[PDB]
Amino acid sequence: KASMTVKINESLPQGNGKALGTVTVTETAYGLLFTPHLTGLAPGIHGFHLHEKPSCAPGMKDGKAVPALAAGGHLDPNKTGVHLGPYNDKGHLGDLPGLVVNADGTATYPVLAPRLKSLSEVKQHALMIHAGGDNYSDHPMPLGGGGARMACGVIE
Amino acid sequence: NDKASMTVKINESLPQGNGKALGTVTVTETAYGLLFTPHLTGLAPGIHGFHLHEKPSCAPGMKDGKAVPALAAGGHLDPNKTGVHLGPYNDKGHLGDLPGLVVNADGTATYPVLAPRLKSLSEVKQHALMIHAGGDNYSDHPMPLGGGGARMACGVIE
Ligand SMILES: [Zn+2]
Ligand SMILES: [Zn+2]
Ligand SMILES: [Zn+2]
Ligand SMILES: [Zn+2]
Ligand SMILES: [Zn+2]
Ligand SMILES: [Zn+2]
Ligand SMILES: [Zn+2]
Known part of the structure; x- marks a missing residue:
């Protein structure tokens, strides 16, 4: 069972907020499954992406x-330069399905990202949770409308 | 580009019979399996069991x-006769197991759910797309069939 854990912290302008829980990343026969164990988030669907640089520090x-901001943009080894979601090979490989947050503010709903196949592809990148949602497109808003970066955890 | 795609209409499941029309679910073939994109309205906020049932009916049963x-839709689609509920990401359970249907705070369903195990529309035609009152933990424990419970909405895939 090739599975690992990622600590998630609040993302503040000053640095790191409180610990909001974790996210389990598991290899399945159908790709990487991200099983959240998060708390204290806004109910609804949140932009959920892997970013290039292994950092959750603030930037200018x-x-x-x-x-x-120090996490850089979306993981994009193919240099597609385009946000197209978890199910389209023509976009940022770091595009995960939206993170589903419950009414109590927790995240427990597992999301499969079929394009990722092994934990190695996930190591040394920032797991990002955005304020806004994700329609898996750059239209009408860039990067699926995620907007601000609200929570983050370096994977490794 | 291009990939095969079809549309299914969803109705309330009442004891009496069919209820309000709730919208549609678009089923599309992708490189990673069948994608179910809902365009639904009038549902209880939260996560709902979302499965394919064996028989091409949404009718009530006695x-x-x-x-x-x-009830007339039978149990979950299970060609391999596993007789077990294990979700969308596990080969050892019902092929008809999809990921939970995510319903927004306003009662709409818009979040696309991928079912990796289904590969083409042919595996899906002439079956019932079912929506439960309860959720789905992709297991028979601690409740049978993921805890879906009552059947609350349904649509037959032509
Ligand atoms: Zn992002
Ligand atoms: Zn992206
Ligand atoms: Zn075309
Ligand atoms: Zn069912
Ligand atoms: Zn089942
Ligand atoms: Zn069939
Ligand atoms: Zn048992």
């Missing part, structure tokens, strides 16, 4: 402090 | 003298 953009 | 909603 237009003079302001931006949560988890 | 069980001990009571009309049971969508």
Whole structure:
């Protein structure tokens, strides 16, 4: 059973917020399954992506402090330069299905990302949770409308 | 680009018979299996058992003298006769096991769910797409059939 764990922390302008729980990443016969064990999130569907750089630190953009900016953009080994979701080979390999958050603010619903096949593809990248949702497109809003980076955890 | 795709209409399952139309689910073939994109409305917020049942019917059935909603659809699609409920990501259970149907706070269903084990529309035609009152933990424990419980909405895939 090739499975591993990722600690998730709140993402503040200053650094790291409280621990919001974990996410289990498991290899299946159909791809990587992300089983969340998170708490304290806004109910609804959240942008859920793997970002390039292994960091959840703040960065500077237009003079302001931006949560988890040091993580860079989306994991994109094919250099597609386009956000197209978990089921389309023509976009960022780091595109996972939206994270489903319950009414009590927890995340327990497992999401399969069929394109990822082994834990190695996930190591040394930032697992990102956004404020906004994800329609798996750059239209109408870029990167699925995720907007701000709200929670994060370096995988390794 | 291009990939085969079809549409299924969903109705309320009442003891009496069919209820309000709730919208549709688009089933599309993808490189990674069948994708079920819902366009539904008027559902209880939360996560709902979402399975394919054996018989091409959504009609009620009689069980001990009571009309049971969508009972005429039979049990879960299980060609390999596993006789067990293990979800969308496990080969050892019902082929008809899809991921839970995610319903928003407003009662709509819009979140696409991939079922990796289904590969083509032919595996899905002439079966019932079922929506339960309860959720789905992809297991027979601690409740049978993921804890889906009552059948609350249904649609026959042509
Ligand atoms: Zn992102
Ligand atoms: Zn992306
Ligand atoms: Zn075309
Ligand atoms: Zn069922
Ligand atoms: Zn089943
Ligand atoms: Zn069949
Ligand atoms: Zn048992």
